Amino acid sequence: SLQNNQPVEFNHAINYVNKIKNRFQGQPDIYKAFLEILHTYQKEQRNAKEAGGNYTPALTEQEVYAQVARLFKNQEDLLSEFGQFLPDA
């Protein structure tokens, strides 16, 4: 259901994801990898929010930044655009 109402964020999302898929079109492994990372983070965040309160996630924002950083070498540009999405943590 979301909460936002600005169609600009959506456009930016597709542009970024498309940029990665195109930049790494040669190696589908990298693309699938990044996706799996985000998916895992989602399941973890939801689990915590569904656990009520008493729960310790194994994958957080900082953890994701570290993993994505190691997998994305010499490509700080993408890692930056990705970090921008993350709020003030």
Binding site: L2, Q3, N4, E9, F10, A13, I14, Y16, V17, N18, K21, L35, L38, H39, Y41, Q42, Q45, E61, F85, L86, P87
Partner: peptide, 16 residues
Amino acid sequence: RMNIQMLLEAADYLER
């Protein structure tokens, strides 16, 4: 929520 869930739906959209 706009940080990860957004990019998730986007990828799932273009993909299928």
